[PDB]
Amino acid sequence: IIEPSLRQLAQKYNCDKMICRKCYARLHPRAVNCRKKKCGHTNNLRPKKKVK
Amino acid sequence: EIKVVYLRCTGGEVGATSALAPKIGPLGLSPKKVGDDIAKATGDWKGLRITVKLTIQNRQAQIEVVPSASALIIKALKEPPRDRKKQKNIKHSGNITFDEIVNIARQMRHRSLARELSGTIKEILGTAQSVGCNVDGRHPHDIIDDINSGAVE
Amino acid sequence: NKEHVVEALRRAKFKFPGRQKIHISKKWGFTKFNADEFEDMVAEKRLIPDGCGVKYIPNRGPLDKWRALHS
Amino acid sequence: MKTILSNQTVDIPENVDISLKGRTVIVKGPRGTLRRDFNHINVELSLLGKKKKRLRVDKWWGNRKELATVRTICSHVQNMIKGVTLGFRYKMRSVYAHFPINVVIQENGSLVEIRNFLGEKYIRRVRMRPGVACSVSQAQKDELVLEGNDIELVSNSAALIQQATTVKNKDIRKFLDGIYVSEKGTVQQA
Amino acid sequence: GRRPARCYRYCKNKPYPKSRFCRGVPDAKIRIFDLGRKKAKVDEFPLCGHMVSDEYEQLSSEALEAARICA
Amino acid sequence: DRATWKSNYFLKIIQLLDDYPKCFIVGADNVGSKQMQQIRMSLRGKAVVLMGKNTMMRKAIRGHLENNPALEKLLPHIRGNVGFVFTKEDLTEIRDMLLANKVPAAARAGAIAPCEVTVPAQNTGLGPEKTSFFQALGITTKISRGTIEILSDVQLIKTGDKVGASEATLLNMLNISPFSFGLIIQQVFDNGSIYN
RNA sequence: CUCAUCAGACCCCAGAAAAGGUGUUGGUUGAUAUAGACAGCAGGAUGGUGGCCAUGGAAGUCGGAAUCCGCUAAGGAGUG
RNA sequence: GCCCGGGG
Numbered sequence: 116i117i118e119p120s121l122r123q124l125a126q127k128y129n130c131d132k133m134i135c136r137k138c139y140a141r142l143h144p145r146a147v148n149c150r151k152k153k154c155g156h157t158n159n160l161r162p163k164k165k166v167k
Numbered sequence: 168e169i170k171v172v173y174l175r176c177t178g179g180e181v182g183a184t185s186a187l188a189p190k191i192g193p194l195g196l197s198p199k200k201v202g203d204d205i206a207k208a209t210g211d212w213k214g215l216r217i218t219v220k221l222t223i224q225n226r227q228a229q230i231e232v233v234p235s236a237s238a239l240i241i242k243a244l245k246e247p248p249r250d251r252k253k254q255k256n257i258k259h260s261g262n263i264t265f266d267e268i269v270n271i272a273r274q275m276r277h278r279s280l281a282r283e284l285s286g287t288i289k290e291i292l293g294t295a296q297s298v299g300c301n302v303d304g305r306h307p308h309d310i311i312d313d314i315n316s317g318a319v320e
Numbered sequence: 321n322k323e324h325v326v327e328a329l330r331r332a333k334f335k336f337p338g339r340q341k342i343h344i345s346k347k348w349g350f351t352k353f354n355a356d357e358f359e360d361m362v363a364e365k366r367l368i369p370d371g372c373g374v375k376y377i378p379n380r381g382p383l384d385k386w387r388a389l390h391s
Numbered sequence: 392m393k394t395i396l397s398n399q400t401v402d403i404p405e406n407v408d409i410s411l412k413g414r415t416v417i418v419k420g421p422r423g424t425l426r427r428d429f430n431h432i433n434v435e436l437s438l439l440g441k442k443k444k445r446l447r448v449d450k451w452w453g454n455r456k457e458l459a460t461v462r463t464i465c466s467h468v469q470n471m472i473k474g475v476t477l478g479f480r481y482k483m484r485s486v487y488a489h490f491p492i493n494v495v496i497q498e499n500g501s502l503v504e505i506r507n508f509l510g511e512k513y514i515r516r517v518r519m520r521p522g523v524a525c526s527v528s529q530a531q532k533d534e535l536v537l538e539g540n541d542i543e544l545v546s547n548s549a550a551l552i553q554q555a556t557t558v559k560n561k562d563i564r565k566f567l568d569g570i571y572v573s574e575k576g577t578v579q580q581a
Numbered sequence: 582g583r584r585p586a587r588c589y590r591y592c593k594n595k596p597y598p599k600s601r602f603c604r605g606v607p608d609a610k611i612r613i614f615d616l617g618r619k620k621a622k623v624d625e626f627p628l629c630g631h632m633v634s635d636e637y638e639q640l641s642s643e644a645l646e647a648a649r650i651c652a
Numbered sequence: 653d654r655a656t657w658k659s660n661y662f663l664k665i666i667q668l669l670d671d672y673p674k675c676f677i678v679g680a681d682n683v684g685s686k687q688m689q690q691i692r693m694s695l696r697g698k699a700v701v702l703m704g705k706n707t708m709m710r711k712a713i714r715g716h717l718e719n720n721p722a723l724e725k726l727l728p729h730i731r732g733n734v735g736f737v738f739t740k741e742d743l744t745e746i747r748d749m750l751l752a753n754k755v756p757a758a759a760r761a762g763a764i765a766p767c768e769v770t771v772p773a774q775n776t777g778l779g780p781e782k783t784s785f786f787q788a789l790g791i792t793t794k795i796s797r798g799t800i801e802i803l804s805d806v807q808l809i810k811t812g813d814k815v816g817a818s819e820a821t822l823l824n825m826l827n828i829s830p831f832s833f834g835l836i837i838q839q840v841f842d843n844g845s846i847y848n
Numbered sequence: 849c850u851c852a853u854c855a856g857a858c859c860c861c862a863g864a865a866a867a868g869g870u871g872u873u874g875g876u877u878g879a880u881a882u883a884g885a886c887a888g889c890a891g892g893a894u895g896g897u898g899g900c901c902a903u904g905g906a907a908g909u910c911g912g913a914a915u916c917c918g919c920u921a922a923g924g925a926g927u928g
Numbered sequence: 929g930c931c932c933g934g935g936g
């Protein structure tokens with residue numbers, strides 16, 4: 116399939132993210148506030164959901 | 168040839184499935200008796216899953232008994248065994264004595280990663296009330312005996 | 321349980337219109353007396369605890385109440 | 392609060408000849424020369440010590456948004472110093488599931504031809520930024536190496552390759568194929 | 582059913598209690614005004630926190646029950 | 653509680669000062685936990701090693717500015733992962749017990765070996781597997797008859813050179829260690845005299 | 849003081865709220881700090897214990913009740 | 929002033 120050394124590399128830019136609940140922005144994994152002005156830089160963040 | 172390897176049995180009561188085979192099976196000696204081949208010279212346990220690291224010879228095993236402290240203070244005052252029923256109030260009840268403190272704090276001297284036995288008559292006593300047995304009371308009576316007045320090597 | 325009180329009233333705030341403050345009171349529970357003076361004035365038998373709150377005992381009744389309190 | 396002075400100094404090695412014409416920085420090393428301009432910031436750039444040992448950055452009378460631009464200049468000049476001494480090497484790896492990603496490098500290392508990214512007949516042509524060498528690394532199956540002196544062109548070119556090999560209209564957490572920056576180091580180690 | 586609370590937020594009218602002049606008044610949504618250990622003594626629960634209003638406004642009984650359920 | 657344990661750590665330094673007016677300033681990073689318990693339990697009457705923050709003991713010199721005038725020349729010496737040894741017995745017996753106090757641990761991926769490290773040429777006893785990580789620079793491997801046989805001795809680590817990640821992982825799957833855990837000395841202070 | 853990729857701009861008055869913001873500025877309260885802190889970079893994570901009770905087996909690493917000791921700089925019968 | 933540190 117894909118070796119896990121490459122799979123962690125792909126998952127780093129594809130799903131190791133935090134998502135703003137208000138504006139669905141794809142944020143860096145250590146984000147506390149969203150970067151977009153449209154959500155008022157809100158702190159309502161959830162982890163990006165993982166595939167099963 | 169002398170062998171040393173980790174081992175986990177049920178002790179004396181009959182189990183359903185062996186817990187010894189995936190390492191000591193290809194070791195040449197009999198992997199069949201090991202459900203109670205660690206019960207050669209128990210004497211006291213007879214119903215408890217005892218954790219043993221012993222010395223293994225190429226024909227059959229050799230007597231080396233290293234207990235739990237929980238097992239050591241369960242078998243300070245002996246409780247009767249039970250079968251696979253395993254009913255409630257099998258937690259240990261019975262007042263441990265100072266004699267049963269200082270007889271099996273000697274099993275804490277010969278591991279020798281501690282203080283002297285003065286430090287371990289608190290160690291096995293701190294195991295004692297966790298496993299459910301007391302020396303004339305719980306810790307606000309045990310530490311009363313232990314301060315300046317605990318008999319010791 | 322102070323932070324639990326503050327978060328409970330802060331959550332209950334959203335059910336209410338307008339602006340509400342959360343204020344930790346100076347008093348002792350649901351009483352009119354200050355929490356600092358409360359315990360020694362219980363000790364001096366100025367407040368007798370009576371269920372949820374207290375009853376104030378002034379120096380003004382008949383002396384048979386004082387004897388019953390100081391027996 | 393207007394802080395009266397925010398300063399930070401950067402130590403400059405023996406190997407590097409540095410110069411300044413106001414708020415442009417001209418760093419010279421073994422690998423070439425880097426100019427970067429900073430007239431958008433309004434700082435004091437001092438070049439102190441004879442033989443030009445320390446580059447010092449001053450911001451006088453700045454609020455927080457102006458104080459934050461001192462260490463940014465120092466980190467940019469440091470990145471230019473490591474660009475002319477040690478270079479920048481961005482090592483990208485080409486993750487695929489079923490369709491092998493075929494990468495052909497053209498024009499001395501200045502154009503990438505990406506083919507069979509997820510079984511597409513469309514060929515992606517990625518032109519490099521000027522001065523960035525692009526190369527397929529030996530002793531590794533699916534890897535690509537970007538080498539240069541400007542970090543902001545090397546990493547932008549890596550971003551161009553990465554955003555050119557993007558999966559569309561599927562679930563990207565399952566369709567993980569693409570060419571991704573895996574290692575960030577220098578051309579010449581130390 | 583019932584109007585939003587912005588229709589009756591402000592204390593515009595005179596006070597109008599239920600009495601022999603106001604009949605056919607439905608019961609309030611809030612009925613219980615005390616929750617938790619009502620039977621707790623005065624020395625068991627010393628710390629008191631208030632939700633204090635900051636406006637001359639009108640709080641509905643529905644809101645007074647919703648906030649006590651939330652708290 | 654901690655507000656008296658600060659001055660109680662100071663008073664533990666005082667307990668060592670009130671028995672022993674000479675210092676073996678040991679600089680020992682990454683030492684083992686149970687073997688350091690054994691360090692306390694070995695020469696327990698005559699020496700013990702304490703662990704802690706170097707700047708408090710350098711402030712304790714100015715705390716003893718003129719009540720312990722021996723330790724005044726011990727301020728600009730303390731650099732590194734430093735413990736204190738306080739002894740009365742000699743310069744020989746405690747030192748050559750601390751010299752051989754050793755324990756092995758697998759080759760660290762990110763640390764250094766201070767001498768010239770060799771490779772054990774023997775069999776491993778396990779069958780066919782991947783190979784080229786040992787030929788990453790050219791060192792030969794002769795896989796035959798199941799067991800993994802090495803031809804000769806081309807040495808691992810040169811003195812003054814680091815031990816990287818891949819080559820340490822090679823020895824981590826091989827259970828080979830360069831040297832053991834050492835309680836290495838930096839500088840000593842003997843009874844009002846500073847040597848190395 | 850404030851930057852608005854919806855700025856703001858003067859009684860009546862001519863358009864906005866709850867809620868929210870690591871935008872930026874101030875202030876209040878409490879700690880945790882030169883008996884040297886906070887990041888960051890490394891190192892140790894110990895024996896009693898592989899814990900009675902359940903569960904086939906769970907040994908700090910599914911669960912509920914036990915949550916003491918000592919050598920200690922430290923380590924919860926252990927956050928994943 | 930004296931001590932430490934580095935820049936001429």
Ligand SMILES: [Mg+2]
Nearest residue numbers: 559560561562
């Ligand atoms: Mg679809």
Ligand SMILES: [Mg+2]
Nearest residue numbers: 592593594595
């Ligand atoms: Mg009206």
Ligand SMILES: [Zn+2]
Nearest residue numbers: 135138149154
């Ligand atoms: Zn957002």
